[PDB]
Design an enzyme around this catalytic site. Structure first.
Site, PDB file in Angstrom:
ATOM      1  N   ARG F 364       0.828  -1.215   0.000  1.00 22.21           N
ATOM      2  CA  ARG F 364       0.000   0.000   0.000  1.00 22.21           C
ATOM      3  C   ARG F 364       0.874   1.281   0.000  1.00 22.21           C
ATOM      4  O   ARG F 364       0.883   2.078  -0.973  1.00 22.21           O
ATOM      5  CB  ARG F 364      -0.961   0.023   1.218  1.00 22.21           C
ATOM      6  CG  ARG F 364      -1.685  -1.279   1.597  1.00 22.21           C
ATOM      7  CD  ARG F 364      -1.409  -1.590   3.076  1.00 22.21           C
ATOM      8  NE  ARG F 364      -2.329  -2.503   3.784  1.00 22.21           N
ATOM      9  CZ  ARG F 364      -2.247  -3.842   3.865  1.00 22.21           C
ATOM     10  NH1 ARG F 364      -1.315  -4.540   3.216  1.00 22.21           N
ATOM     11  NH2 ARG F 364      -3.151  -4.502   4.580  1.00 22.21           N
TER      12      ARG F 364
HETATM   13  N1  LIG Z   1     -12.232  -1.676  -0.656  1.00 21.98           N
HETATM   14  C1  LIG Z   1     -11.027  -2.092  -1.113  1.00 21.98           C
HETATM   15  N2  LIG Z   1     -10.678  -1.938  -2.415  1.00 21.98           N
HETATM   16  C2  LIG Z   1      -9.477  -2.354  -2.881  1.00 21.98           C
HETATM   17  N3  LIG Z   1      -8.545  -2.947  -2.104  1.00 21.98           N
HETATM   18  C3  LIG Z   1      -8.764  -3.164  -0.783  1.00 21.98           C
HETATM   19  C4  LIG Z   1     -10.050  -2.738  -0.204  1.00 21.98           C
HETATM   20  N4  LIG Z   1     -10.012  -3.065   1.094  1.00 21.98           N
HETATM   21  C5  LIG Z   1      -8.809  -3.645   1.330  1.00 21.98           C
HETATM   22  N5  LIG Z   1      -8.063  -3.706   0.212  1.00 21.98           N
HETATM   23  C6  LIG Z   1      -6.690  -4.275   0.119  1.00 21.98           C
HETATM   24  O1  LIG Z   1      -6.568  -5.399   0.995  1.00 21.98           O
HETATM   25  C7  LIG Z   1      -5.521  -5.225   1.960  1.00 21.98           C
HETATM   26  C8  LIG Z   1      -6.108  -5.236   3.379  1.00 21.98           C
HETATM   27  O2  LIG Z   1      -6.352  -3.927   3.909  1.00 21.98           O
HETATM   28  P1  LIG Z   1      -6.636  -3.615   5.471  1.00 21.98           P
HETATM   29  O3  LIG Z   1      -5.570  -2.662   5.955  1.00 21.98           O
HETATM   30  O4  LIG Z   1      -8.081  -3.205   5.596  1.00 21.98           O
HETATM   31  O5  LIG Z   1      -6.397  -5.018   6.226  1.00 21.98           O
HETATM   32  P2  LIG Z   1      -7.168  -5.434   7.573  1.00 21.98           P
HETATM   33  O6  LIG Z   1      -7.574  -6.878   7.417  1.00 21.98           O
HETATM   34  O7  LIG Z   1      -8.233  -4.421   7.868  1.00 21.98           O
HETATM   35  O8  LIG Z   1      -6.041  -5.302   8.726  1.00 21.98           O
HETATM   36  P3  LIG Z   1      -6.338  -5.248  10.324  1.00 21.98           P
HETATM   37  O9  LIG Z   1      -6.311  -6.693  10.777  1.00 21.98           O
HETATM   38  O10 LIG Z   1      -5.188  -4.430  10.869  1.00 21.98           O
HETATM   39  O11 LIG Z   1      -7.679  -4.574  10.513  1.00 21.98           O
HETATM   40  C9  LIG Z   1      -4.765  -3.960   1.570  1.00 21.98           C
HETATM   41  O12 LIG Z   1      -3.501  -4.312   1.005  1.00 21.98           O
HETATM   42  C10 LIG Z   1      -5.644  -3.253   0.557  1.00 21.98           C
HETATM   43  O13 LIG Z   1      -4.872  -2.781  -0.552  1.00 21.98           O
END
Ligand SMILES: Nc1ncnc2c1ncn2[C@@H]1O[C@H](COP(=O)(O)OP(=O)(O)OP(=O)(O)O)[C@@H](O)[C@H]1O
Ligand SMILES: Nc1ncnc2c1ncn2[C@@H]1O[C@H](COP(=O)(O)OP(=O)(O)OP(=O)(O)O)[C@@H](O)[C@H]1O
Ligand SMILES: Nc1ncnc2c1ncn2[C@@H]1O[C@H](COP(=O)(O)OP(=O)(O)O)[C@@H](O)[C@H]1O
Ligand SMILES: [Mg+2]
Ligand SMILES: [Mg+2]
Ligand SMILES: [Mg+2]
Lengths: 466, 85, 110, 314, 85, 496
Positions: F364
């Site tokens: 990211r």
């Molecule tokens: N709505 C979206 N559109 C495109 N890509 C996304 C979207 N949501 C997440 N991603 C991709 O998926 C990955 C996960 O993002 P995120 O930081 O939300 O992980 P997470 O599971 O929320 O982590 P945590 O456990 O800390 O909450 C990122 O690399 C991001 O680029």
């Protein structure tokens, strides 16, 4: 009176008191460490000794060090002074902006609202996200959970929700970072300054209060930051009689942190090594996160799912505290469909024809019907393929696959990776769009036309670009 | 933990000392019994795996030699073995 | 926990409590415990003897009977302390004293 | 150093108490007044001048009070050319009924893996003379090779020929560690080697292989340490005679099982699929001794059994 | 979220038809809803639904919600059962 | 008082122990030593055993101190003398560590003598808070075309290297270190720390040889707690290395740290926890296994100007089993780090090396912190290569046979040997060649031969052009276009 340290094991510290014992939950001040170290009384062991949980690093403690009873539980600053400030679990500023000069300090422990004071307001909260609004809509001062395995999209989703709801909210907001990434805290802090919801020059104009105890913090701190955050939100709920937003990434880390100390408090472990108090620990915290007749709290809590196992006791016990559930799926995310929401595992206590209307209601059940039918086929398609389906099931497959993609949507906050401008679709436009697809009005449009767009008009336009 | 052979009745003979009272070498007294297991005080010379004999005539195997007791597995009905046998 | 100390105390202290009860001791025995409990409240001596690990059980066996009033302990008093030490639990000394004193009170009463 | 006495006997675990200075963990103890020589490897220091040991033979017949002597070091076994053609056990006694193993020196079966600076910065092929291997999947000098496929696929013949060949093309000897040998198969392996010549029962210096058995009927401790025994014999040929040695380990899985059993018996909470918490260090502290130093190398062929045909099993 | 609570609620509401029909014979049926470990919010909706329907007049609600001590949640079912007996 | 004092001389045992600063060892086994005394020792303080071995005060209990031994427990006996050092567990730090190979405690093992460290640092310090940091904006160039184009990394980021065994995880780490020579010679350095955890000693020795023979070792620190080192040393290694990286982070410099690998660190800690009899959970790991890695990777960060503008970048390595990225530890780390580079056995077993799954992999913060010229070509590459990955289940009409055309060619451009990282300027040039069509006439089987020939041709004829792209960092400028046009036209002519 003053007491003395008899034992130190990780965040657990035992203290002997020559005279009166400090009650459970009381905050103690450990002397002669260089920095303020708070200990919270967990239990009375006997022999005038108490077990406590430290709110910071216990490295450097020595047997015999002096400890002071404050005469009350951990108390933190609360009121309009918290807005635009960043605090830690024990009320100390961590924004390098100087001391928090509060007119009120409040204990992070509190009775949950009484039955007679409970509110039963059922009103939709429109997010502008198609999957959520259509299939499992949020409820204004209701409790919302965002479930997801590692890197499936929980944080992106909660940030989009702050961008879509907190923006265009009249009242105040509280964000609580619990056991997550510090640099996400840095990004959020600077993002909010940019957008003006936080102002470092007019700290009265700030609309958000920040509380952070991230994954660099020891268990005791992470185990309590959520109470600290929610305590700030309780004030805005009552003391102003307004609507409050409470954002928590990630409330799982509350239960995880408690799991770490429990292993050292002498509790016999329960399922998967978790604390036996898992359900009641969560309950005494969660039941404060609620609407009363005095005011409402709308909570959005990201919930981590160990090993993608929803039957893990932590997440499994969280469902019982929610009014809406958005379950993210790794299989969906891997198909490129974001947000990765499982349309058949996500529910809302507001999805009722008497609440959302019969049109909204009917279209949701219809979408889920066709998706479930497609699901039941997928197994048979994996080996033999699509050519073995009935001329009718071929049709449900077609619409289903178009519906799967139409549930996908580009976010504003994900522009940084997708390169696609974010979109917000109004609930009325979501129902209609999905009704038309279900009725077959776009069986002539190609799948790709539906993927990563907003309203149906964008679908047709894309179908023209091709 | 307390451990066996720290019982009111057993500690009497350790401090009082009767006539030719010892015999802790070739003989012992049941401290505890249940589920085909008899904890026995004494038998200082009994060997690991040795087949010993209860007062009922029942046989038992010394599988556990511990500091202050011997764990004996019973080749019979434990109803016929009691504390002090 | 510490409550575990009472389990042994109740037994070890009862063992001797029986010998004196049936054979003859209680009356004169009360003094032995009284004087013994008085010496135990020599903080420096008491702690050094009872609570700290001094390696050798032999070193602590004779030392125990010696530190006591080579006078105010009947045969059983000397036999008990040694045996108690021999088991690596002579440290539980107060736990037993209080227990023995109560035995007398039960034997007396109302 | 001193003489201790037995305080507890619970299966293959024996507690010993010493009036003098206590033997360090991993020291070999000699239990006195028994029909056969009984060895005890120190595992823990319990306190109260008492140690907890694991037994290298059966413990039936032991009595509380029995005297035990501290040898002053870990288990020592004979090393040198006098081991070639002979069959040995964990503690170095002959199990071929051919009399004493009259070597000039003995060596401890526990030893630190080669020093960082002593490591070989090179990656060299150990030519075998075997076409399929050398061409397509060449053996690395100082490396480990996993030998898959049980009986009926010419395992024993491959082992024997690798022995023969390494002796021809490198002047290096071999060592077979049968970890959990079935006595029947130990007898047969012995006679197949004599028949094939890699063993000669007349000229013991002409023999190319030293055999070390940990039979299945021995307690877990012995089955756990045999690989070290055989490893120590081979270290002699690398360090003292600068040779490229072959070290066979049949079977590496039973090495892990023994460890698991020993760990279970010492009261240690078991890990993953019931394996020892020390699974990684038990395997690693052993395997790391197999390598190329500046002086020579030990190359190892290891029969590998895969539980439930699951390659992801711990 | 499969509809479990919903079956029990509707079941309580359903009795209104028969409650009052005493002599005609179709016996009354009093209702007891024991809430264990739930959200107070959920119980409130529930009670509001029963009141609105006029079913609360024949129903007892026993509530040991998520914030109530474990021993309270353990007893709740037995307490309501007694009220039932 | 009165009936007293006579008790003292008759006993005459214990003449005078000194139990505030010293202890004696009640028992030892299962990795932990219990110590009588040390009445003034601190939680997490270093102690010394009479053998000269170190230990950490873990448990402060009412009647004893539990110590974790940084060494083989074989070397400690009941009754041994133990002395406090007055210091919370700490290690040597500074530039005197660069080029040297040390153990987990900071002691030299390279045979080049003492470490000569001037500064020392506590190993388990908490990560910097929210304010001192700022979003990453400086490239951390691996020199791997696949990574630097499609999974771009930034200074201060945490990027996971995850994949099954023998997929080439370590190799990505090694090429990344070697790559930095190009920049460290300039006058925006990147110092490297390679932490070996549980690996084979020979692997690390071969590593150092390679670093030395490339002249990359001069800016690299190797921290080694290999397979034969005791679990507590393997547990500690990363924290120690992290402290050494922080030295640079806090003095306006940049450091890179590789944890190869954290799977093994986690099993070592599990071993310590189980022997301590702590309650086992998922896969028998202790409830605080997440926390073990969280502390660690949170210390990798990008600091703002007010704190010197320095950074610490982390490349944690994780080993999966049969591609199980939903297991406990992998899921832990995925939720710690800022993205992942996934390696696939299938890609490896087919020759695609490095075996990077560009479909899954993400980064990211790194995307925004990548060079302009790369930015101009790599976006389309990602998209196209993906679309090709979407198609290739067919392996037609007109444009679909064209996608398999570019796709297979672009795929061949992403292949790369080991120990041959490429400057960003070279990478844009080669990626530009495939994206603009200048390979479509070539046989797929010859793309590697072409690329190798093209690169040697640019290095030897157009250093100036390469220099300008670097120095200026530009987009694909109309100037750079015309220049690129000439380089490829001429080269193509001499190639065929
Ligand atoms: N709505 C979206 N559109 C495109 N890509 C996304 C979207 N949501 C997440 N991603 C991709 O998926 C990955 C996960 O993002 P995120 O930081 O939300 O992980 P997470 O599971 O929320 O982590 P945590 O456990 O800390 O909450 C990122 O690399 C991001 O680029
Ligand atoms: N027959 C039905 N028709 C329409 N909607 C229904 C029906 N049955 C249940 N529902 C809806 O399903 C939702 C969940 O049902 P219910 O209240 O029984 O939860 P539950 O299954 O007990 O799960 P939990 O234990 O999480 O409360 C309710 O909001 C309700 O409106
Ligand atoms: N770019 C590459 N080209 C060819 N082979 C490679 C490449 N990268 C790695 N390998 C091969 O992968 C194997 C294992 O490499 P390594 O980095 O140790 O992976 P791991 O760390 O996952 O074990 C080596 O035999 C090596 O030859
Ligand atoms: Mg998050
Ligand atoms: Mg319900
Ligand atoms: Mg590796």
């Amino acid at each position: 009176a003053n007491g003395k340290i008899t034992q130190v094991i990780g965040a657990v510290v035992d203290v002997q008191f020559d005279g009166q014992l400090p009650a459970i939950l009381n905050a103690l001040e450990t002397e002669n460490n260089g920095k303020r170290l708070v200990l919270e009384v967990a239990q009375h062991l006997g022999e005038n000794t108490v077990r406590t949980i430290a709110m910071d690093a216990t490295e450097g403690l020595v047997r015999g060090l002096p400890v002071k009873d404050t005469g009350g539980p951990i108390m933190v600053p609360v009121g309009d002074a918290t807005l635009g400030r960043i605090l830690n679990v024990v009320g100390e500023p961590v924004d390098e902006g100087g001391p928090v000069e509060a007119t009120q300090t409040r204990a992070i422990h509190q009775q949950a609202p009484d039955f007679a004071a409970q509110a039963t307001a059922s009103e939709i909260l429109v997010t502008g996200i198609k999957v959520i609004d259509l299939l499992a809509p949020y409820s204004k001062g209701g409790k919302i959970g965002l479930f997801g395995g590692a890197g499936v999209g929980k944080t992106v989703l909660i940030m989009e929700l702050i961008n879509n709801i907190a923006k265009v909210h009249s009242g105040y907001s509280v964000f609580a970072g619990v056991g997550e990434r510090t640099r996400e805290g840095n990004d959020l802090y600077h993002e909010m300054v940019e957008s003006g919801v936080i102002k470092p020059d007019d700290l009265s104009k700030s609309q958000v209060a920040l509380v952070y105890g991230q994954m660099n913090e020891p268990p005791g701190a992470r185990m309590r930051v959520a109470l600290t955050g929610l305590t700030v939100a309780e004030q805005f709920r009552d003391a102003t009689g307004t609507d409050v937003l409470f954002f928590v990434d990630n409330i799982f880390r509350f239960t995880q942190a408690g799991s770490e100390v429990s292993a050292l408090l002498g509790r016999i472990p329960s399922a998967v090594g978790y604390q036996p108090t898992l359900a009641t620990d969560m309950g005494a915290m969660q039941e404060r996160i609620t609407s009363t007749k005095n005011g409402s709290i709308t909570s959005i809590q990201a919930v981590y799912v160990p090993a993608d196992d929803l039957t893990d006791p932590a997440p499994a016990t969280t469902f019982a505290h929610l009014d809406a559930t958005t379950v993210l799926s790794r299989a969906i995310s891997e198909l490129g469909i974001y947000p990765a929401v499982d349309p058949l595992d996500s529910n809302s206590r507001i999805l009722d024809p008497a609440v959302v209307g019969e049109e909204h209601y009917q279209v949701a059940r219809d979408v889920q019907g066709i998706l479930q039918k497609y699901k039941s086929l997928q197994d048979i398609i994996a080996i033999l393929g699509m050519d073995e389906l009935s001329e009718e099931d071929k049709l449900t497959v077609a619409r289903a696959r178009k519906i799967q993609r139409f549930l996908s949507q580009p976010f504003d906050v994900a522009k940084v990776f997708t390169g696609s401008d974010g979109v917000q679709v109004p609930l009325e436009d979501t129902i209609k769009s999905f009704k038309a697809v279900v009725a077959g009005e776009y069986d002539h449009l190609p799948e790709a036309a539906f993927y990563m767009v907003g309203g149906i008009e964008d679908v047709k336009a894309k179908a023209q670009r091709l | 933990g307390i451990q066996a052979a720290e019982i009111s009745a057993i500690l009497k003979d350790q401090i009082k000392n009767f006539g030719q009272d010892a015999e802790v070498a070739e003989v012992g007294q049941v401290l505890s019994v249940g589920d085909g297991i008899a904890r026995v005080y004494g038998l200082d010379k009994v060997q690991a795996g040795e087949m010993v004999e209860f007062p009922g005539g029942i046989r038992g195997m010394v599988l556990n030699l511990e500091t202050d007791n011997v764990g004996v597995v019973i080749f019979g009905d434990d109803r016929d073995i009691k504390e002090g046998d | 926990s510490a409550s575990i100390s009472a389990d042994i105390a109740g037994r070890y202290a009862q063992a001797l409590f029986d010998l004196v009860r049936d054979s003859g001791g209680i009356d004169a025995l009360s003094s032995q415990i009284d004087d013994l409990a008085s010496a135990y409240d020599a903080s420096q001596d008491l702690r050094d003897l009872t609570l700290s690990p001094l390696y050798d059980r032999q070193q602590q066996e004779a030392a125990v009977g010696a530190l006591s009033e080579r006078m105010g302990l009947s045969a059983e008093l000397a036999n008990t302390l040694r045996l108690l030490a021999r088991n690596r639990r002579l440290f539980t000394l107060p736990q037993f004293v209080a227990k023995l004193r109560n035995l007398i009170a039960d034997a007396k009463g109302e | 150093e001193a003489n201790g006495k037995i305080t507890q006997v619970i299966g293959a675990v024996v507690d010993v108490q010493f009036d003098g200075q206590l033997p360090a963990i991993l020291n070999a103890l000699e239990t006195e007044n028994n029909g056969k020589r009984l060895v005890l490897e120190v595992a823990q220091h319990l306190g109260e001048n008492t140690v907890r040991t694991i037994a290298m033979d059966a413990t039936e017949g032991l009595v509380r009070g029995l005297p035990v002597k501290d040898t002053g070091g870990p288990i020592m076994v004979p090393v040198g050319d006098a081991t070639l053609g002979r069959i040995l056990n964990v503690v170095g006694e002959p199990v071929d009924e051919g009399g004493p193993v009259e070597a000039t020196q003995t060596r401890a079966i526990h030893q630190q893996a080669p020093d960082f600076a002593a490591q070989a910065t090179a990656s060299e092929i150990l030519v075998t003379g075997i076409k399929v291997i050398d061409l397509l999947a060449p053996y690395s000098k100082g490396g480990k090779i996993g030998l898959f496929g049980g009986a009926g696929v010419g395992k024993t013949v491959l082992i024997m020929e690798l022995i023969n060949n390494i002796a021809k093309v490198h002047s290096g000897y071999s060592v077979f560690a049968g970890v959990g040998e079935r006595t029947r198969e130990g007898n047969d392996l012995y006679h197949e080697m004599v028949e094939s010549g890699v063993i000669k029962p007349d000229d013991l210096s002409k023999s190319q292989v030293a055999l070390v058995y940990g039979q299945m009927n021995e307690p877990p401790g012995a089955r756990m340490r045999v690989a070290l025994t055989g490893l120590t014999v081979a270290e002699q040929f690398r360090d003292a005679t600068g040779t490229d040695v072959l070290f066979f380990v049949d079977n590496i899985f039973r090495f892990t099982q023994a460890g698991s059993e020993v760990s279970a018996l010492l009261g240690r909470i078991p890990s993953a699929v019931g394996y020892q918490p020390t699974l990684a260090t038990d395997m690693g502290a052993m395997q790391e001794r197999i390598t190329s130093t500046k002086n020579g190398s030990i190359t190892s062929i290891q029969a590998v059994y895969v539980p439930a045909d699951d390659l992801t099993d711990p | 979220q499969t509809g479990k609570t919903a079956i029990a609620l509707d079941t309580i509401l359903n009795q209104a038809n028969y409650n009052g029909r005493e002599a005609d014979g179709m016996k009354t049926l009093h209702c007891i809803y024991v809430a264990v470990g739930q959200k107070r919010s959920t119980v409130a909706q529930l009670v509001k639904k029963l009141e609105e329907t006029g079913a609360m007049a024949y129903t007892t609600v026993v509530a040991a919600t998520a914030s109530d001590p474990a021993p309270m949640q353990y007893l709740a079912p037995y307490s309501a059962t007694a009220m039932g007996e | 008082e009165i009936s007293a004092i006579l008790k003292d001389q008759i006993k005459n045992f214990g003449q005078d122990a000194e139990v505030a600063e010293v202890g004696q060892v009640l028992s030892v086994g299962d990795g932990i030593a219990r110590v009588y005394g040390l009445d003034k020792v601190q939680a997490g303080e270093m102690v010394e055993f009479p053998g000269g071995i170190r230990g950490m005060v873990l448990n402060l209990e009412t009647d004893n101190v539990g110590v974790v031994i940084f060494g083989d427990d074989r070397d400690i006996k009941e009754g041994d003398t133990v002395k406090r050092t007055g210091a919370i567990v700490e290690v040597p730090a500074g530039k005197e560590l660069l080029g040297r190979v040390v153990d987990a405690l900071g002691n030299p093992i390279d045979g080049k003598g003492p470490l000569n460290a001037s500064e020392r640092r506590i190993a388990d310090v908490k990560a910097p808070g929210i304010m001192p940091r700022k979003s990453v904006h400086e490239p951390m160039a691996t020199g791997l075309k696949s990574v630097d184009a499609m999974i771009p990394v930034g200074r201060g980021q945490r990027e996971l290297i995850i994949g099954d065994r023998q997929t080439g995880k370590t190799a990505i780490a090694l090429d990344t270190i070697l790559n930095q020579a190009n920049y460290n010679g300039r006058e925006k350095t990147l110092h490297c720390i390679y932490v070996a955890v549980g690996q084979k000693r020979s692997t690390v020795a071969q590593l150092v040889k390679k670093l030395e023979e490339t002249g990359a070792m001069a800016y690299t620190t190797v921290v080694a707690a290999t397979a034969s080192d005791p679990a507590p040393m393997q547990y500690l290694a990363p924290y120690s290395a992290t402290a050494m990286g922080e030295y640079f982070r806090d003095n306006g410099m940049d450091a890179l740290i590789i944890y190869d690998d954290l799977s093994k660190q986690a099993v070592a800690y599990r071993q310590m926890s189980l022997l301590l009899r702590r309650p086992p959970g998922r896969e028998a790991y202790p409830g605080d296994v997440f926390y073990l890695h969280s502390r660690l990777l949170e210390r990798s960060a990008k600091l703002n100007e007010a704190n010197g503008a320095g950074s610490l970048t982390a490349l944690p390595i994780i080993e999966t089993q049969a591609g199980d990225v939903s297991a406990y530890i992998p899921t832990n780390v995925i939720s710690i780090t800022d993205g992942q580079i996934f390696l696939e056995t299938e890609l490896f077993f087919q020759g695609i090396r490095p075996a990077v799954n560009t479909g899954l992999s993400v980064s990211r913060v790194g995307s925004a912190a990548q060079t302009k010229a790369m930015k101009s070509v790599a976006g389309p590459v990602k998209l196209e290569l993906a679309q090709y990955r979407e198609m290739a289940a067919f392996a037609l009409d007109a444009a679909t046979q064209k996608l398999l055309n570019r796709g297979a060619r672009l795929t061949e451009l992403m292949k790369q040997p080991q120990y041959s990282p490429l400057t960003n300027a070279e990478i844009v040039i080669v990626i530009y060649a495939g994206t603009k069509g200048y390979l479509d006439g070539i046989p797929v089987r010859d793309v590697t031969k072409w690329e190798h020939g093209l690169l040697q041709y640019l290095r030897n004829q157009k250093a100036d052009l390469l220099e300008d792209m670097t120095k200026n960092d530009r987009k694909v400028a109309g100037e750079l276009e015309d220049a690129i046009k000439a380089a490829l036209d001429g080269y193509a002519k001499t190639y065929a």
